């Protein structure tokens, strides 16, 4: 276990303890546990090159004397899901993970012509909050949301 050196661009430096055999998704959660900034949120880069969540650090040949840049995305990168409807069809939405759950249910909304308040959103049977960020459920290129109907009878 080495200490690593995290600066966060325009903020401060940090020193965190990894292994070589740490992923650089655990390096984003030990970073999010010890500052607050969620994961997704987090662009890592090394010489200047974004750093892949799945690699190894000393497979990026990362090491006591190396340096990690640090950027908290603002506004951060498409990526595209599945949202699955109560007929038990998926379509394809393209989402960024730093808006909020309000703006996926306007253009399920938009595209399906119904009143948001016909329906809701799930992922992985946690209901979604329409002010929450669209990251805190930790969705992922094409995971799947469902959608649940509040139709009326009579």
């Known amino acids: 276990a080495w200490?690593?050196?995290v600066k966060m661009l325009g903020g401060n430096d940090f020193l965190v303890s990894v292994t070589n055999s740490m992923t650089v998704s655990e390096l984003k959660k030990q970073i999010a546990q010890k500052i607050g900034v969620p994961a997704f949120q987090q662009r890592l880069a090394h010489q200047t090159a974004v750093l892949q969540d799945g690699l190894t650090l000393s497979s990026l040949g990362l090491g006591p004397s190396s340096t990690v840049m640090l950027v908290?995305?603002?506004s951060s990168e498409p990526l595209s899901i599945l949202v699955?409807?109560?007929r038990?069809?998926?379509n394809i939405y393209e989402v960024f993970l730093?808006?909020?759950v309000d703006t996926l249910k306007?253009?399920?909304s938009q595209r399906e012509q119904v009143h948001e308040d016909?329906?809701?959103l799930s992922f992985?049977?946690?209901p979604m909050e329409d002010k929450e960020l669209l990251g805190e459920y930790g969705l992922k290129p094409q995971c799947t949301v469902i959608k649940h109907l509040r139709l009326r009878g009579g």
């Open 72 to 74: 908290v995305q603002n």
């Open 3 to 5: 200490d690593l050196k």
């Open 106 to 108: 306007k253009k399920v």
């Open 84 to 86: 699955r409807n109560e």
């Open 124 to 126: 992985e049977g946690r």
């Open 98 to 100: 730093t808006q909020t």
């Open 88 to 90: 038990g069809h998926s």
């Open 118 to 120: 016909q329906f809701w």
